Design a protein around this ligand. Structure first.
Ligand SMILES: *[C@@H]1O[C@H](CO[C@@H]2O[C@@H](C)[C@@H](O)[C@@H](O)[C@@H]2O)[C@@H](O[C@@H]2O[C@H](CO)[C@@H](O[C@@H]3O[C@H](CO)[C@@H](O)[C@H](O)[C@@H]3O)[C@H](O)[C@H]2NC(C)=O)[C@H](O)[C@H]1NC(C)=O
Ligand SMILES: *[C@@H]1O[C@H](CO)[C@@H](O[C@@H]2O[C@H](CO)[C@@H](O[C@@H]3O[C@H](CO)[C@@H](O)[C@H](O)[C@@H]3O)[C@H](O)[C@H]2NC(C)=O)[C@H](O)[C@H]1NC(C)=O
Ligand SMILES: *[C@@H]1O[C@H](CO)[C@@H](O[C@@H]2O[C@H](CO)[C@@H](O[C@@H]3O[C@H](CO)[C@@H](O)[C@H](O)[C@@H]3O)[C@H](O)[C@H]2NC(C)=O)[C@H](O)[C@H]1NC(C)=O
Ligand SMILES: *[C@@H]1O[C@H](CO)[C@@H](O[C@@H]2O[C@H](CO)[C@@H](O)[C@H](O)[C@H]2NC(C)=O)[C@H](O)[C@H]1NC(C)=O
Ligand SMILES: *[C@@H]1O[C@H](CO)[C@@H](O)[C@H](O)[C@H]1NC(C)=O
Lengths: 121, 106, 270, 203, 48, 48
């Protein structure tokens, strides 16, 4: 069925990076874009960047110009977001999402809510 | 860059009686606008496909109005089942942005 | 030939001996002392983002137009940008362009095959130069186009994009028109150059003297009067003495003019 | 009825100040002493074509003529400038309205703006997709016809609506003359006084 | 034949390799104008 | 220097952006010819 599955949960000391992944399912992976978003408990959503799974292309937010790097695997039908140099301000809730760029330009499918807890101790 | 501001910061609300939101941007977008709601768990779902018309997957209780710069949302009849927060969002030109957040509370 | 008036005279006559008389040898000139740059003190950056980085452009049968006004458009970030495969300026040199001032600069945005972007030219008649987007003869303005295969191309074909092919006389330049008349495109990532979608933006402006609104990012300087100065008003350059005047202008007119077509009075832009 | 276009139809051809100089220009003006069709508004606004330009003027004492309709076919499919003067705020729109059987008023929008005793003169021409508007307001005291005298029309607004216009119409408010001329490429000799305003002209 | 009758507007809008052709048209036209004037004065001066 | 001494043959064979340069050669040559003739008459008229 059309649904995006989420990686899970991480507890990570500051400094150590995270690789994050987005399990797509049930739709034409080659005809729909993929979009990643993050928010924090008590704060709204922020867009980080998008990928075209059909053919290589990418657009990034400037506030995450270096921290976020996005990649995709069509064969596994999955997308990946990598975060480098995590901080306590990266303690956030992340949602993967489907974007229909060629369609109505909407976030029609989402994850189930991934909470990233960063703790110094 | 486009900035999307929502005027009704907090509305105290009681079930049934009419309530309306509005979205004010910084400049013209056209008609490529969407709305998303966040239940307290945090999962969003589509309500407004394009700024004026309700998506085919939503009851006609929800309707939108305005274009370009002034946008509004109306609730036909509010109830505790519809306790949610609405985010103005645009996707006409990069970068994609999001709203500030408007709260409903008894 | 500049040591003293006598040596200058010898040079003019091409001789080492000068007969008695009066000779005309040169021309007296007062040099300008300083520079004056006067631009309107508007500071809003210019919304080229919503034009260049638009998510999906319009199709060439119904090409778009956006008004660009009340902005200080830094064109350098355009010309410095590398994504543009075709930045071509007619009647204006792109490096000089950044100092000028304009009264109505228009952005036209539409997508066409990468092969035929050469038909975006003042003449060069063709299937899109006649029925789809007729470009007026000998205008001033830059056509800026880029590759869009990363964005606007669908696997299995993108058919959202239409161009008109029609069976009548082409009407007029800068005019859009709304067998069947509309032909779909076939944009595919498998397609290389040719049948490849190129995003096209043509900035059309006038470069004639009228109250301006889209100027360059040049800082203004205080203006000095009653002394020979080198002035620059909204891209109008020259040397002369600026004094107060009792010439009664009217709101639609900024520049006075002489019989010999030289400027005779300016309105201070601030 | 018809009347004579005595000394009307000369506008400032450019945006450049001039003074005490005779300037010859080639442009589309209203020929002197031509006949312009006179329409009434008592006890009335047919199709008016748009060959290559139109001079339009009206004289009012209560502001009954309030608008214009342009465009080829007028079924809200093509844009049609629309002006409404609601006694307090000048209202101008280019919205594609569908009008009544008789387009009038009673006592994909691409623009909107909000700000016999009076003769209000206009020039309408379309050059390469630019709809060019010139105007001037002047006091008059005459009920018979166009008063005899000279006035220049400065431009005020330029809407690049990009229509293909071959027809137009006026809009009347129901509980007032207007004149229709056509422009041609006449060369005019324009006499500028020492204050920079056009004071005479020779066709 | 040039794009403008004002010399500064060519320089203020074109970079040199293009302006050089546009200026040559003004120099040729203006130089011919002086020769016409001077010739008219030489004939007229002989009449006086 | 033009391709033809007949003005209609340039217009009847070239579209305007090209014809404009070819015509300019004929105008310059023919305008100079009139100035030569008129100058010759002004000097000759003084002799008479
Ligand atoms: C069209 O978009 C490009 C790319 O901008 C990036 O991608 C978009 C999809 C959006 O998500 C943008 O938010 C995002 O930044 C624009 O070019 C970009 O301009 C910015 C200017 O701030 C450049 O930022 C640089 O950042 C470095 C490091 O901080 C500084 O050293 C620089 O001085 C500069 O500030 C960015 O590098 C640049 N990106 C590219 C690929 O060139 C572009 O300006 C925009 N079009 C218009 C008309 O604005
Ligand atoms: C100009 O305004 C007119 C009416 O004022 C509008 O045209 C009509 O409206 C629809 C959409 O609102 C236009 O798009 C059409 O929609 C159908 C339905 O989804 C779609 O299958 C097609 O893509 C079609 O283009 C359409 O032009 C017209 N309606 C019909 C039934 O043809 C529109 O708001 C403006 N644009 C145009 C081009 O008319
Ligand atoms: C503006 O639109 C009009 C119509 O909407 C077009 O002008 C001309 O319209 C006529 C309508 O009958 C077209 O048919 C031809 O007319 C000519 C005389 O104009 C006639 O000799 C023919 O036998 C035929 O009936 C005509 O093709 C059309 N002209 C053009 C050039 O298309 C046109 O779309 C626009 N006119 C402008 C921009 O001047
Ligand atoms: C041009 O306008 C000026 C100022 O409006 C006129 O100068 C004065 O005008 C007033 C009345 O309009 C009078 O005091 C005199 O007629 C003028 N005073 C002078 C000349 O010292 C001027 O007359 C106008 N020129 C015209 C109308 O041709
Ligand atoms: C009115 O127009 C007619 C042409 O039908 C012309 O003969 C007549 O002279 C015009 N009237 C005046 C006063 O010029």
């Amino acid at each position: 069925e059309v649904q995006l599955q989420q990686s899970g949960a991480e507890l990570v000391k500051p400094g150590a990076s995270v690789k994050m992944s987005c399990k797509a399912s049930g739709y034409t992976f080659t005809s729909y874009w993929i979009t990643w978003v993050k928010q924090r408990p008590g704060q709204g959503l922020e867009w980080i960047g998008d990928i075209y799974p059909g053919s290589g292309s990418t657009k990034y937010n400037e506030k995450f110009r270096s921290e976020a790097t996005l990649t995709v695997d069509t064969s596994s039908t999955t997308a990946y977001m990598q975060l480098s140099s995590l901080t306590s301000e990266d303690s956030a809730v992340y949602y993967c999402a489907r974007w229909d760029f060629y369609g109505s330009r909407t976030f029609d499918y989402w994850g189930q809510g991934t909470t990233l807890t960063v703790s110094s101790a | 860059d486009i900035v999307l501001t929502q005027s009704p910061a907090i509305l105290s609300v009681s079930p049934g009686e009419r309530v309306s939101f509005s979205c004010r941007a910084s400049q013209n977008i056209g008609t490529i606008i969407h709305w998303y709601q966040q239940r307290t768990n945090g999962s969003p779902r589509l309500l407004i496909k394009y700024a004026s018309e309700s998506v085919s997957g939503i009851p006609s209780r929800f309707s939108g109005s305005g274009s370009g710069t002034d946008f509004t949302l109306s609730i036909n009849s509010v109830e505790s089942e519809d306790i949610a927060d609405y985010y103005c969002q645009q996707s006409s030109s990069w970068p994609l942005t999001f709203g500030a957040g408007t709260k409903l509370e008894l | 030939c500049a040591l003293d008036p006598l040596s200058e005279t010898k040079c003019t006559l091409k001789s080492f001996t000068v007969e008695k008389g009066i000779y005309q040898t040169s021309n007296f000139r007062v040099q300008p002392t300083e520079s004056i740059v006067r631009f309107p003190n508007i500071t809003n950056l210019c919304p080229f983002g919503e034009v260049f980085n638009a998510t999906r452009f319009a199709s060439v049968y119904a090409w778009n137009r956006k008004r660009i006004s009340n902005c200080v458009a830094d064109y350098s970030v355009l010309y410095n940008s590398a994504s543009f495969s075709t930045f071509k300026c007619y009647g204006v040199s792109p490096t000089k362009l950044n100092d000028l001032c304009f009264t109505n600069v228009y952005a036209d945005s539409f997508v066409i095959r990468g092969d035929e972007v050469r038909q975006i030219a003042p003449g060069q008649t063709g299937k899109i130069a006649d029925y789809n987007y007729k470009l007026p003869d000998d205008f001033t303005g830059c056509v800026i186009a880029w590759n869009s295969n990363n964005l606007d191309s669908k696997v299995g074909g993108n058919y959202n994009y239409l161009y008109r092919l029609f069976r009548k006389s082409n009407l007029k330049p800068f005019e859009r028109d709304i067998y069947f008349p509309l032909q779909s495109y076939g944009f595919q990532p498998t397609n290389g150059v040719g049948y490849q979608p190129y995003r096209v933006v043509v900035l059309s402006f006038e470069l004639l003297h009228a109250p301006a609104t889209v100027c360059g990012p040049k800082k203004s300087t205080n203006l000095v009067k009653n002394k020979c100065v080198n002035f620059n008003f909204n891209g109008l350059t020259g040397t002369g003495v600026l004094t107060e005047s009792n010439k009664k202008f009217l709101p639609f007119q900024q520049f006075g003019r002489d019989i010999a077509d030289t400027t005779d009075a300016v309105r201070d832009p601030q | 009825a018809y009347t004579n276009s005595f000394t009307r139809g000369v506008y400032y051809p450019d945006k450049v100040f001039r003074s005490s100089v005779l300037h010859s220009t080639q442009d589309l003006f209203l020929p002197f002493f031509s006949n312009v069709t006179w329409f009434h508004a008592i006890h009335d606004n047919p199709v008016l074509p748009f060959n290559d330009g139109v001079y339009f003027a009206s004289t009012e004492k209560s502001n009954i003529i309030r608008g214009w309709i342009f465009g080829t076919t007028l079924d809200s499919k093509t844009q049609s400038l629309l002006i409404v003067n609601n006694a307090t705020n000048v209202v101008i729109k280019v919205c594609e309205f569908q009008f009544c059987n008789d387009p009038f008023l009673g006592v994909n929008c691409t623009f909107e703006y909000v700000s016999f005793k009076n003769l209000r003169e206009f020039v309408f021409k379309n050059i390469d997709g630019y709809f060019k508007i010139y105007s001037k307001h002047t006091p008059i005291n005459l009920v018979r016809d166009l008063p005899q005298g000279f006035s220049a029309l400065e431009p005020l607004v330029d809407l690049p609506i990009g229509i293909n216009i071959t027809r137009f119409q006026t809009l009347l408010a129901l509980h007032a003359a207007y004149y229709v001329g056509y422009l041609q490429p006449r060369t005019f000799l324009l006499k500028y006084n020492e204050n920079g305003t056009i004071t005479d002209a020779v066709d | 034949g040039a794009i403008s009758s004002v010399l500064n507007d060519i320089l203020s809008r074109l970079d040199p390799p293009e302006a050089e052709v546009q200026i040559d048209r003004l120099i040729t036209g203006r130089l011919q104008s002086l020769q016409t004037y001077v010739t008219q004065q030489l004939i007229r001066a002989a009449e006086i």
